[PDB]
Design a protein around this ligand. Structure first.
Ligand SMILES: COc1ccc2[nH]n(C[C@@]3(c4ccccc4)NC(=O)NC3=O)c(=O)c2c1
Ligand SMILES: [Zn+2]
Length: 251
């Protein structure tokens, strides 16, 4: 492990929804919530031994927090991830999750090209219990260009998002930590843990499921906050190929 290339620096974005409902319309409340969440997610990453030996100490740190205090004004027919209305259905509390992640990646493209990862934090009730989405596991850690035929420019796939609203209420901070860990897990190259591999999806008596299980882990079982051996094997291959490309020294 290279100590000069062991940290994935993040551009963290809080949209107007997050600012209003999680930050109570205050910059200090907004940033403290995000700073503490990323630090606890960093504890999971930094303590993970990707090869089950000495290949550990890889983590995440915030480089910048963008705080969008108000909705982004748009021209008729124009969209933006920070706009007041949801898309494609303005009558719903939330955007379609896939369309929102693509829109965010489009709008933040210039900034995303300069950072290991960009992550959107929002407050909207995605359909069917969805809490977040991310590229990777193409895309994930280090900007990878995608030419958007619709957008007519390159966007970067080093992005993901977390919503702290689910089923009409604010999720627990212990649940929010798990969402962001799972989304960044996909960015780091992990796919979902399959039922077919008991080592990677244990029963409740064996500590329960790991963070990459497709059904949202609650955080009450031991394994919930941890990466399975399946995730470790996938991520180990990524870190070994990506740290030299865009990781930096821990601050
Ligand atoms: C620990 O937090 C978790 C754990 C599992 C989760 N599953 N989902 C839905 C989901 C998705 C994939 C494709 C389309 C829509 C949603 N997003 C994601 O990253 N994995 C998916 O299956 C969460 O939102 C989620 C959050
Ligand atoms: Zn997932």
């Amino acid at each position: 492990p290279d100590p000069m290339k062991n940290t994935c620096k993040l551009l963290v974005v809080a949209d107007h929804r997050f600012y209003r409902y999680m930050g109570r319309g205050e910059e200090s409340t907004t940033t403290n919530y995000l700073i503490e969440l990323i630090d606890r997610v960093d504890d999971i990453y930094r303590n993970t031994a990707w090869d089950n030996a000495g290949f550990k100490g890889y983590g995440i740190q915030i480089e910048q927090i963008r705080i969008l205090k108000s909705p982004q004004e748009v021209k008729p027919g124009e969209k933006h991830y920070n706009m007041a209305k949801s898309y494609p259905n303005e009558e719903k509390d939330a955007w379609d999750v896939k369309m929102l992640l693509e829109q965010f990646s489009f709008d933040i493209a210039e900034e995303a090209s300069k950072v290991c990862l960009a992550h959107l934090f929002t407050y909207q009730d995605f359909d069917m219990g969805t809490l977040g989405l991310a590229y990777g596991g193409h895309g994930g850690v280090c900007p990878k260009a995608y030419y958007s035929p619709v957008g007519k420019k390159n966007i970067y796939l080093n992005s993901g998002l977390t919503s702290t609203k689910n089923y009409g209420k604010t999720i627990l901070t212990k649940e929010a930590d798990l969402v962001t860990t799972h989304e960044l897990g996909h960015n780091f190259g992990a796919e979902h843990d399959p039922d077919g591999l008991a080592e990677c999806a244990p029963n409740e008596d064996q500590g329960g499921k790991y963070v990459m299980y497709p059904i949202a882990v609650s955080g009450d079982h031991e394994n919930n906050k941890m990466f399975s051996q399946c995730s470790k094997q996938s991520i180990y291959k990524t870190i070994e190929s990506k740290a030299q490309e865009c990781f930096q020294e821990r601050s």
